[model samples]
Target: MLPLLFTPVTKGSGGSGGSGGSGRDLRAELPLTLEEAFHGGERVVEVAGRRVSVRIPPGVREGSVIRVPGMGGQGNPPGDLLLVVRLLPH
Candidate 1:
């Protein structure tokens, strides 16, 4: 019930309002393969240098891992940058 905010401004990376979304903390594990669940059409995004494009909607099957919230990393709120997903339960 959390995680889904991608702010793509691209200016700083938000150390505290420089540019580009970031509440702090990044790269937490997002490597879902198997041809996009073999049918869902796999799509993953990386947010290390800032800039995400993750689209695996459809109620997000093979559940687990989905946090890219507004590149969270400001004064103090978010700091996981977790991208946990293991899609594929067959």
Candidate 2:
């Protein structure tokens, strides 16, 4: 379980930050191995009461932001969750 700090970016959504997930939204920042980064596969990421299975395509470069629809900062229309790529050091 990762401790996430998310501020509402929406303008006047009328929802406080404390209201989402009892003030601690479940956000994940997982590190991928070199092999996994090179050859992507299924990955399990858990969010607030949601366990998502992601299929990462092979040969994704670093700083790539993969947007997971309906998975992001909390709102009536949820924000997009980002999958960031962190390449291994040479």
Candidate 3:
């Protein structure tokens, strides 16, 4: 089915970079949209499925890791949702 193409918890970025799918991992590479990375901003990103509102910190750039407290040990299958931001063209 069409949905099967988005099966990865977090897909690869080997080609023209774009939005990535979420999975069960507590950490992932956030394919930050160009508009969303204008220094800093707000966004509801998918950590797995339901998503979480993120107050993206300033000084963001490639490889910037942002910690998500809401996705910690309480319920996440792993540890925490640490996001490594990368500039992905919109």
Candidate 4:
């Protein structure tokens, strides 16, 4: 399951009246098959968007963090998409 971690940022007094910032970042714990993990390929999945592609490296192990940079929330500097790998049992 994928869980988003959002950080709320409040506006400063000098700033004009506006709503606070809600930083949305996608963080997911995903299970992978042994074959998929051992042999890398492009893994595509749908999120809020229609489709998102993730590259799986060969010989990837559990607890590996796959970073999809600049794919996070709307901001001056966008956030990152972090995926944690968990090997699934046959």
Q: What's the lDDT for all of these models?
A: 0.48, 0.55, 0.56, 0.64
Angstrom error at residue 40, model 1: 14
Per-residue lDDT of candidate 3, residues 1-90 (tens digit): 111101124445456666442233345566777667876877666543555566777668888878765453324233345677877866
**Per-residue lDDT of model 2, residues 27-89, tens digit only:** 344455678778888666654545667676687777765666565666555565666756666
* TM-score per candidate, chains pooled: 0.26, 0.53, 0.54, 0.64
- Model 3, residue 32: distance off in Å is 0.9
What is the lDDT, from 0 to 100, of the residue 5 in candidate 4?
Answer: 29
Off by over 4 Å in 2: 1-30, 73-76, 88-90
Writing each residue's lDDT as its tens digit, candidate 1 over 14-84 gives 46544554345544445565566445443645343445566653444444666656444434445444556
Residue range 36-81, candidate 4, lDDT tens digits: 8999786665655447667778999899977767675546756666
Model 3 bad stretches (over 4 Å): 1-25, 73-78
> Clashing pairs in model 2?
none
lDDT of 3: 0.56
Q: Which one wins by lDDT: 2 or 4?
A: 4
Which candidate ranks first by lDDT, i.e. highest?
4
Q: Which runs in model 4 stand beyond 4 Å of their true positions?
A: 1-23, 74-77
Cα error, residue 38 of model 4, in Å, equals 0.4
lDDT for residue 23 in candidate 2, whole number 0-100? 24
